[PDB]
Amino acid sequence: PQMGTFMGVYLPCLQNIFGVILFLRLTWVVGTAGVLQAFAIVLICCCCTMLTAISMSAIATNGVVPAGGSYFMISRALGPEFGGAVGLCFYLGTTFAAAMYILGAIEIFLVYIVPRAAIFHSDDALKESAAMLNNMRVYGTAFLVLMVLVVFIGVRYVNKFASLFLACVIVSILAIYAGAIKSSFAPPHFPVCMLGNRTLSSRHIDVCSKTKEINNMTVPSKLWGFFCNSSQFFNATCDEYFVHNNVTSIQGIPGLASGIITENLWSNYLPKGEIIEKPSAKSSDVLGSLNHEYVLVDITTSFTLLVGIFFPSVTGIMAGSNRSGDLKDAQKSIPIGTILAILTTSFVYLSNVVLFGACIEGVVLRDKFGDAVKGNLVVGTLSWPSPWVIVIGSFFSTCGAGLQSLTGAPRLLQAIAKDNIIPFLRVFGHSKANGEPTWALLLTAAIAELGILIASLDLVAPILSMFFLMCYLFVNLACALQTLLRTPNWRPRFRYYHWALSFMGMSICLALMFISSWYYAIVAMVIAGMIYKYIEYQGAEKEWGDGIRGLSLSAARFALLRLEEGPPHTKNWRPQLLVLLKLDEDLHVKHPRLLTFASQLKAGKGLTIVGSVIVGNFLENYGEALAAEQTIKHLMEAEKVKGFCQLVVAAKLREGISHLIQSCGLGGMKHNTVVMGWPNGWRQSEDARAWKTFIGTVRVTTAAHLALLVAKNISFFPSNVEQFSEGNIDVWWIVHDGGMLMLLPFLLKQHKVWRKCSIRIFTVAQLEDNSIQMKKDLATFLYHLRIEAEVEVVEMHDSDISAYTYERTLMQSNVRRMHTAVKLNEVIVNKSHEAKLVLLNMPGPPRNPEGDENYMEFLEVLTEGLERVLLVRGGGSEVI
Amino acid sequence: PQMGTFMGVYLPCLQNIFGVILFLRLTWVVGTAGVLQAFAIVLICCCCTMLTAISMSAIATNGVVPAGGSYFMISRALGPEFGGAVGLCFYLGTTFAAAMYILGAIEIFLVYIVPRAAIFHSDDALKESAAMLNNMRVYGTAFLVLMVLVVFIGVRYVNKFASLFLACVIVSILAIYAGAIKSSFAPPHFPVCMLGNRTLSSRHIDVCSKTKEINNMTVPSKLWGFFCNSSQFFNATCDEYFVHNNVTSIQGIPGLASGIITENLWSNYLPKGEIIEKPSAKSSDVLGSLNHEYVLVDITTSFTLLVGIFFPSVTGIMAGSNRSGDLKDAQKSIPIGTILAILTTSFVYLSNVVLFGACIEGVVLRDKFGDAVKGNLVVGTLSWPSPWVIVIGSFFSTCGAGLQSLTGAPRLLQAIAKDNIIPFLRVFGHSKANGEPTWALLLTAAIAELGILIASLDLVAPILSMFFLMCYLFVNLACALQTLLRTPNWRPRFRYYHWALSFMGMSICLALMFISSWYYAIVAMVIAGMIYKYIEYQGAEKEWGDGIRGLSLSAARFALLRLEEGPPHTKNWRPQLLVLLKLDEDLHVKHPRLLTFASQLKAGKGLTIVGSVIVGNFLENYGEALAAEQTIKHLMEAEKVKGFCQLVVAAKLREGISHLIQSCGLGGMKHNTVVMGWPNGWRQSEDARAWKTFIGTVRVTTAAHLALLVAKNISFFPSNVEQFSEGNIDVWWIVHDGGMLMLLPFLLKQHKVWRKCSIRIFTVAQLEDNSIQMKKDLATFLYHLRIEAEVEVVEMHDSDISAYTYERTLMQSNVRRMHTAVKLNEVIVNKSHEAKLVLLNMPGPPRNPEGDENYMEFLEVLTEGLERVLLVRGGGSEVI
Ligand SMILES: *[C@@H]1O[C@H](CO)[C@@H](O)[C@H](O)[C@H]1NC(C)=O
Ligand SMILES: *[C@@H]1O[C@H](CO)[C@@H](O)[C@H](O)[C@H]1NC(C)=O
Ligand SMILES: *[C@@H]1O[C@H](CO)[C@@H](O)[C@H](O)[C@H]1NC(C)=O
Ligand SMILES: *[C@@H]1O[C@H](CO)[C@@H](O)[C@H](O)[C@H]1NC(C)=O
C-alpha cells in the first residue's frame, strides 16, 4: 500500500529503458555515424522523450490519479476518445518490444554463447544472409512458446525475480564504466590484424603474417591458403592485392590516452558490401576482387536509418507509472520520479558514445558481431572482470525485459476490453481468477510472431519506433489542445509546464515519423484517425440513444457547456431576436410581416426564436399545439428564417408572454432582444386589458433588461420579394439611446430589400452648441466604419422634451407630456415625411399602474400617421 | 443579356486552356518521356481536371447561380469560409499565369523571331545559362509595364480583340493537324546532320561533310574548324572522335509511313549535360571530351518533373463560367459547356503526343530551341503553309492569354475586398468609375514580377501548378464534405454526380501535390488551413458580437439547426433528465437528494435541466432570481452535475410547473423525462391543493407523453460520498411498462455508489404459464447484454390487479382498488424487504377530477413503509 518515489516509479522505469540496444547496436551506431552525427541522434531522441514526460506530468498533476496502470491516467484525464488511440498504439508497440527483445536474445546466444550449433548451416559464401535469417525464424519461435507458457503459468516467480533482472543491468552498466577507466593508464590486450586500408576477418586464423615460422621450415601461413590458390609452396598464381601488400597487426584498444576523438570524428556511411577500410594505412592500388575472407558492410546505412534503429533504446516511459495504485503522493511522484529516470538514462547514452570513440579503434567499431576480435563483444572488451560478465548479463537483461513485455500486453488489452469502448474486442476481456487472460495472451503471441518472421533487429526497430512515436505524438497533441482550447475540467497544476512545450514535442515526433518511412507514416496517421472517430461515433450510440444525429447533439452539449465559464457581457452587442406572434381563433399568425422583417435583419445569421401562446387548459389541446407549430415551421422556412420555435398552451395571455421572455434559449444561448407587433385596433371594445398586456410586456423587458423593438403600421411592410429604391431612413437620437440606434440602420441596408436607400441622421439636441456634438457623431462614424450616413441637428426647447429628460434624470405632468407629443411630431414629418422607415426612441413607461393612458396616447400622437416606424429602446449595452 | 452555351461558356473556356505549352514544351515532353510515359502524364492531368468540372457542376446545378464571375458561385454555395481559400489560391495562380505567359512570349521572340538582338551576350561557352536567364529578367519587365498600362487604360480594346486571340489559336491548332496529314505520303524537306550516336548543333554550319568541295580545291570543311585545332590543312592534332567517325546527314521527318511508335517508344530521361544520343547509329568508342559545338541536356529531367511542367496546359476551367450573368440557362450551361470543352482539349493533347512520335525523329524531339533544325520550331516544321504562321500565331496567343490573365487578377481581388471578409485587404477594393482598380493592379503587377526574376518557364510552372492544385483540391474537398455530412441547404440536382467522385479527385490532387515538391506541399496546406480558420474566427467577431466564445456559439447553432431535419424517434430511447426542485421561503432546495440521484444516473453525460419556480410578481424580485440561480449553480457543481438551469418567477405554482415541462430545451435538444420529489408531509393542514399540484404534474406528463420518475422517502437517499455493498434491487414488471424498467437498473450500477449491489427481477405475472414468459425475459437479457440480473415470477390473482388491467385495457371500483393495494404490498415486502432500492410502476391517474384521493391513498399503501423506491412510468418508447 505504501511505496516511495525511488523503489516505486524510478526503478521500474529504469528497468524498462536500459536493454538490448546499449549492448547490441550502440557501438555500431558509434562507428558508423562517427562521434558527431551519432551524438546528434541521441539528443534528438532523448529530447523527443523528455518532452513527453513533461506532458505526461501535466496528466499526472491534473486529476484524481486513478489507481492501477498508466492507461487510466491517460484515459480519464483526456476523455476516452484519445485513450482508444494512445492506449492501442502503446499496445502494438509493446508486442513488438517483446519480439525485439527476444530476437536480440537469440542473436547473442547464436553468435557469442553458442556459435557452434546452428541448424541451418551456410551452404556457400553468400548464403550468410539467408542462413542467419533462417536461423532467427526457426529459433525464436522455439523460445517464444516458452515465454508465453511461463507468463501464463509461472507468473508468481516473474513478479519475484524482477529485482535480479535489474540487478543484471546494474552490474552490466558499471562494468563498461569500470573497465573504461582501466584502459586509461592500463589497457588490456586485444590485438587486431590489418592489411592495407582494408582488413580481414580474424576468426579462424590465429597468428597473422605472410609466412609461418615453423621451427625448422618457415611455411607460408594460413593466409596464403586463404588468399592464394591453395596451401602449397611460396609461389605464383596468387592474388594481386595480397602479394603487393603486407600483413600488419596493430592494437584495437589505444585507450583514452591517445587522441582519438580528433581523428575518429567524421561520418563513415557506406553502401552494403563495402570492405571496412581504415582511413590511415599504407595500400597498393592493385584492385583485387578477391572477396573470400574479409569484413563487409552488412546492410546499407544512412543517418535517417540509424535514428529509427537507435530509438527503442529510449522507450519505456509509460512503464514508469505502472504502480500508481501503490503510491502515496502520485501527483508529485510521476513528474519527479520519471523525469529523473530520463536524466539518468540520457547521461549514460551520451557518455558511452564519447567513451567508445575515445577508447576503441574505429575499424572494429564498424565491426558487427566481433568478427575481427574473434567473436568477442566490442563492449565486452571494455569489461574489467570478463566479457562473459556482460555477455551472460546482457543475455539475461533482454530476457527479463522480454519477460516484462509480455505481462503488459496481456494486462492492457483487458483494461480496454473491460472498458467496453470497442465492441469488436469484447471477447478479449475474459480473464482468469487472478487477472490473466487467455485471449489477450493469444493476441500478444500472434502479433509478436510476425517480428520473428522479420528475423532482424534492424528491421523490427523501425517498425517498433513507429508505434511508440504514434503514442508520444498523441500524448503531446492532446495535452496541447485541451490547454489551448480550454476543454472543461482541465487544470494542469504543474510548475514546469507550458502549452507550447507539448506543441514543440508534437512537431518533433512528427518530424521523426516521416523521416523514418513516409508510406508507413501516412498509413499510420490515417488508421489512427478513423479509429479515433469510431470511438466518437460509438459514444453517440450508447449515450444519446443511437444514430449519427447524436454526434451533433454531443457536439451541441460540448459547446453549450463551454460558455458557462465566462460572462456574456465581455465586449460587444448584437441583437438576438425573440419575436412573438399573436394567434387568434383558427390559429394563424396575426402579422407575418414581423417574420419577414426579422429575417430582414439576421438573414442566415444568429439566434432567432419565434414566440407563440395558446390560452387555456393544456390537458387536451396538445395535438393542436403539435399542429400549430407546424404552421410556423412552414412559415419560417418560407421567409428564409433559420430559427427556433416555442409554443405554449398557457392559461392567460399575460402569463405566457411574461414567460417566454424570461425562459427562452437554454444556457448560454440566450435571446438578446424582443420584437413585437402592435395593438392596432386600439381604441375599441374589449381589448383594453389586451392593450395592457402589451403594456405588461414593456415592464417585463425593463426588469429583464432586454431591448425592445416594436413595429407600427405592420401591414404596410415590404415583403421579401419587392425592393426599395431612394427613400431616406431617419434615426432620432437621445444621448441615452445607445449604439443600437447607430447599428440598426447599418444592419438594414445589408439586406437587398433595404439596399438602395439613404440614411439621414436627424438628431435631437438638448445642449446649446452643435459643432462639437456633430464632431461627436463624426468621430463615431470614423469609429463605426459606417460613414455613409448623413447628419442633421434639431433643437427647439428642452421643456418640450420634459417627457424625456424626466426619464433621463431617472437614468398634470402626464398631460404636460401630451402637449409636447404634438409639438415634436411636427418636427418629424416636416423633415422626414416620405421616409420608407423611421427610427424613434421608446421612452420609459411609468411605474404607476394608472399611467396606462398617460404613456400611450402620448405615443399614438408620437406615431402621427407615419408610414413605417420602429419604436426602440434597450438597456445596459456596449458597442465597440 | 441573352447568350448561348457555345459562344458563352465554351469559347471563353477554350480560349483559356490552349496556350503556350502546346507550342513551347510539348514536344520536349514527347521526346523525353517517350510515347508511353508522356501518354501517362496527360491522362493523369486531364482526369485531374475532369473531376473538378464535375464537382463544379454540382455547384452549378445546386443553388441560385448568382450573376457575375465564378467566385460568387463558389462562395455562396459552400459558405464564405471556403471562398476565402478557393478564391485566394486561384488569385495567386492567375498572377503567375500572366507571368508565365509573358515569359513564354519573350522566349519565342528572343529565340525564333529576333535571335540577333540580345543585350546580354554570352561571354564564354558556359555563360549560356546565365546569359539566357539574364535576358529574361531584363526583357520581360520591359514588357510587363506595357501590359499593365494597357489593362489600366486600353481595357476597351482588349474586350474587343478577344476574338482575334482565339482566332490566333484556332488557325494555329489546325495547321499542326493539316501539316500532319501532309507528311503522310508527302513529307517536306528538313534535313538533320548526325555523327555517331551523338550529334551536333547545325546553327552556323550549312553543309555537313568532313571536307568541303570547293570547285578546284576540296578543303576540310567548317566542321574541321569546329573540331580540329583550326581552319588549316588536312592534318593531325585533331579530335579522337571526329577522326574515327564520319559525317552523316539524315532526314528528321520520316513521316507517318515509317514505323516510329514501335521504335521511338521508351523513356529517355538523362542528367543535365548529357549529349543527345541517337539509339541507332554507328559509333567508335574513342571517348573525346570535346564539348564545343554539340547538343546537350539543358536541365536534369525526371517523370515527376514533367508532370509539374505540363500541368498548366490543362488549367483555366474556372474561366469557363466568368460570364454567368449573361446566360439564360446557367444551371444547364456550366455542366454542359465546360465539360465538353474539357473533352475537346483532351482530344487535342492525346492526339499530338501520338502525332509527334509518329512523324518527327526522336533526336530532334529532345532538341530544345530547334537548334539542330536551324532555329525552326519543331512544331513549325509540321506546318503546311509556313512555320512563321505558327511562330507569329503562338506569339499572339500567349500574348492575349497574358492579356486575359491580367483582367481577372485585378477584378477578383475587388470581389473579395468588397466582400470585406478579410480586413487586411480592405484597401484593395477602391475601384474606378468603371470597375478597374489601382491597388489590385498594383498587387497583381508585383506578384507577377517575381516570376520574371525566376526567368525560366520550367521553374515557374511547378510553382504555378501548386496553386491551381490548391484550388482544385479544396473544390473537391468542399463538395464531398457537404454531400457526406449533409450540410443544410445543399441539394446537388445533377445527373452525373456522386459524392465519391469528388473524393477520388480529392485524392489525386493530393497525390499530384507531394510528388511535385514536398516541402512546398506541406507549407501550402498549412498556410491554407490557418487562413481558413481566420475566416471562421472573423465570422464570430462580426455576427455573435465578438470574441472566441462566439465560435462555440456558432458551432452550437450550426449543430442545433441540423436535427430539425429528421424525427427524434428514429431508433432508441435514453433518459434525458428534467429535474425540478421546490423552493420555500429563504429560498433553498427542499430536497437536494434528487440532484445527487440525477447525477447518479447520467454522470458526465447528456442533457440535464434543473427546474425551479418562484411565486408572484416578477416585476421586482428579478435580482433574487439572479441570486437564487447562483445557489443551484454552486450546488450542481458540488454534486458533479453538468447540466443547465432554468428559473421562473411565475404567479402560481401550477402554472410554472406546467410550463417548464413543455418549454425547456430549445429545438432538437429536448428533455426526455421528468424527475420529481414527493409531497412528503402529505396528510397535513393546507398543502392539499399543493398535493394536487403534484397531481397536476402527472396529467401534464401523460399529455406531453414524457416519462416520469418520482422518488419516495427522499431524505433516506445515499450521498455521492458513501457507497453500498450487497443489497438487492427489484423491478416489478407489467407488460405495458417498457424497457425503461429493464434499462434503469442497468444505468444505476455503473455509478460507484450503486456498484456492489445485486439485481433481483421480481416480475408480476397475469397469464398462466411462466416458462415461456421466463424465456421471454431471458431472450431479452441475451438481447440487452445485461444477463447479470436474476429473475423470479409471482402471480396470485388477476382480480387483485384490476387496478392495473383496467388501465391495460385502456392502453366502489376505486375502493375496490384500495383493498388490492394492501394485498400486493404484502408480496413486495416478503421477498424484498431489505432492498436498497425498489422499482415500482406508477399506474394511470384517473381522468376524473375527484379521483384525487382515489389514486393517492392507493399509492400511499403502495409505499408500505419501504426504504427507497422509484415510481416510474413512461409512454411511447423503443429500446433496441
Ligand atoms: C610491408 O612489410 C614488410 C615487412 O615484412 C616490409 O619489408 C615492406 O617494406 C612493407 N611494404 C610497404 C610498407 O609498402
Ligand atoms: C586506401 O587506399 C586506397 C588507394 O591505395 C584509397 O584510394 C582509399 O581511399 C584508402 N582508404 C581509406 C582512406 O579509407
Ligand atoms: C564513314 O563514312 C565513310 C564515307 O565517307 C565511309 O567510307 C566509312 O566506311 C564510314 N565508316 C564507318 C561506317 O565506320
Ligand atoms: C552509342 O555508342 C556507344 C559506344 O559506341 C554506346 O555505348 C552508346 O550506348 C550508344 N548510344 C546510344 C545507343 O544511344
UniProtKB/Swiss-Prot annotation, chains A, B:
The modification Phosphoserine is found at S554, S799. Belongs to the SLC12A transporter family. K/Cl co-transporter subfamily. This is Solute carrier family 12 member 6. The chain crosses the membrane at residues 30-63, 82-105, 106-134, 252-272, 283-305, 337-363, 387-407, 408-430, 448-467, 468-483. GO terms for biological process: angiogenesis; cell volume homeostasis; cellular hypotonic response; cellular hypotonic salinity response; cellular response to glucose stimulus; chemical synaptic transmission; chloride ion homeostasis; chloride transmembrane transport. Keywords: Cell membrane, Charcot-Marie-Tooth disease, Chloride, Disease variant, Disulfide bond, Glycoprotein, Ion transport, Membrane, Metal-binding, Neurodegeneration, Neuropathy, Phosphoprotein, Potassium, Potassium transport, Symport, Transmembrane, Transmembrane helix, Transport. Changing T809A: In CMT2II; abolished WNK kinase-dependent inhibitory phosphorylation; constitutively enhanced potassium-chloride cotransport activity; reduced acute swelling response to hypotonic stress. Chloride 2 binds at I261, T262. Coiled coil: none annotated. Signal peptide: none annotated. Inhibited following phosphorylation by OXSR1/OSR1 and STK39/SPAK: phosphorylation takes place downstream of WNK kinases (WNK1, WNK2, WNK3 or WNK4) in response to hyperosmotic stress and subsequent cell shrinkage. Activated by N-ethylmaleimide (NEM). Inhibited by DIOA, bumetanide and furosemide. It is a multi-pass membrane protein. Residues 500-509 are annotated as: Scissor helix. Disulfide bonds join C193-C208, C228-C238. GO terms for molecular function: metal ion binding; potassium ion transmembrane transporter activity; potassium:chloride symporter activity; protein kinase binding. The lineage of its organism: Eukaryota, Metazoa, Chordata, Craniata, Vertebrata. Glycans are attached at N197, N216, N229, N246. Residues 867-880 are annotated as: Interaction with CKB. K(+) binds at I261, T262, N264. Expressed in brain (at protein level). Highly expressed in heart, brain and kidney. Detected at lower levels in skeletal muscle, placenta, lung and pancreas. Detected in umbilical vein endothelial cells. Chloride 1 binds at L265, W266, I421. The modification Phosphothreonine is found at T596, T809. It comes from Homo sapiens (Human). GO terms for cellular component: axon; basolateral plasma membrane; membrane; plasma membrane; synapse. It is linked to Agenesis of the corpus callosum, with peripheral neuropathy: A disease that is characterized by severe progressive sensorimotor neuropathy, intellectual disability, dysmorphic features and complete or partial agenesis of the corpus callosum. Charcot-Marie-Tooth disease, axonal, type 2II: A dominant axonal form of Charcot-Marie-Tooth disease, a disorder of the peripheral nervous system, characterized by progressive weakness and atrophy, initially of the peroneal muscles and later of the distal muscles of the arms. Charcot-Marie-Tooth disease is classified in two main groups on the basis of electrophysiologic properties and histopathology: primary peripheral demyelinating neuropathies (designated CMT1 when they are dominantly inherited) and primary peripheral axonal neuropathies (CMT2). Induction: Up-regulated by VEGF. Down-regulated by TNF.
